[model samples]
Target chain A: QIEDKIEEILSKIYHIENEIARIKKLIGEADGLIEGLRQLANETTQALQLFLRATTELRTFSILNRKAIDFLLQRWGGTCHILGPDCRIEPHDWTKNITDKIDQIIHDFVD
Target chain B: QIEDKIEEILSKIYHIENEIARIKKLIGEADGLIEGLRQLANETTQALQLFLRATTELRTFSILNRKAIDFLLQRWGGTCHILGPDCRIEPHDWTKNITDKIDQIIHDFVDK
Candidate 1:
């Protein structure tokens, strides 16, 4: 009976060791995933900045081109005029907002 | 000696049990972080889509407005000549690319 009890304890120890190994493996994978997520967030931020820059460039282009065309038309004795109401391209703070959200998520995870 | 050995084995069992519990707690926290990461990815994807849409709208507006101006100038007996070389605003597939990356990360994690 003592031998049987000792064998049972040995089995439990082996099982617990295996469990620890498995958990360690999971922890390693989780660390990788967290790193990947951080990279993804960084990439997304860059893309958002690119998007913002593109929109701003377009708006600036429209304003500068319009002024140039107006100048040329005036020189040619013709007035430049709009056919309808002008459209406004408003600036957005999406990058700031998104980055804040990403920051919050990371902060929460870290804490 | 047998009693001492048995007591030592019991103590080992208790220590192992505590270690298992500690690891379990870590696993639980890891699971939460993974879930949070998934949610963050989803939120980022949505933000990207919004950005893309905003850019596309601006491009479309520029095209349509330029056409309207050209047509009006032509009707008024003046040629609407561009002052210099026109700038091209190219469309990008950033959203598709970024989402694909997010998908790959998730796929890798799930397999692991």
Candidate 2:
């Protein structure tokens, strides 16, 4: 009975040590998990910013090109229009040919 | 060549308009995805609440059951027959041992 009592106390101490070890493992794993999630969020944010910049640049370029073409046509002749500062047309024609030319330019440039 | 250019121009314009339409569709799909994520977040939050409640209840029950078992043993003066308020003389040794008596009671109550 004396030996049994010592054995039981030793056994309980062993279990207490095991529980401490288990909790320490869980703490280590939780720290790793938090670091992993932090890295993931940073990488995702970097990627999202890159995509936003690319999309904005594309949209801006397309809009500006179309507007510049319209302005050039209004100042001069059909397809032969020059962006010379001294040259001017009587009136601005937002005509069908203006659109046809734009469509042709975008298709040719893009394709 | 002229006809080809015209066709190409028309096709390009068609694609541009289609690109706008496709963007709208993409936006709609992305919106739905955001809404779905919001709903999933709400459901996950609810599940977390339930998990916390269950964990608390389980811990409480574990303590209560241990306390009750200890109390019964002390009172009945059987296992861990600690000299206490009710049970004097510890083991009566009158009839069957308390373990056998308890086992019989449990079997009758539960195993029916």
Clashing pairs in 2: none
DockQ: which candidate is best?
A: 1
Model-by-model DockQ, in order: 0.31, 0.00
Query: For residues A2-94, could you state the per-residue lDDT of candidate 1 as single tens digits?
Result: 888788888888888898888888778788776767665565555555565565556655664464446545655444233233323334546
Query: Per-residue CA lDDT of candidate 2, range A1-111, in tens?
Result: 655655565565556556555655654555554444445434433443453344345445544543554454553352223323322221222233333433332332222
TM-score of each: 0.63, 0.32
Retained true contacts (fraction), each candidate: 0.31, 0.00
Write one digit per residue (lDDT tens) for candidate 2, span B1-108. 655545655565565556456444433323333333343333323333333333333333333333333434453665455635553323223223433544453444
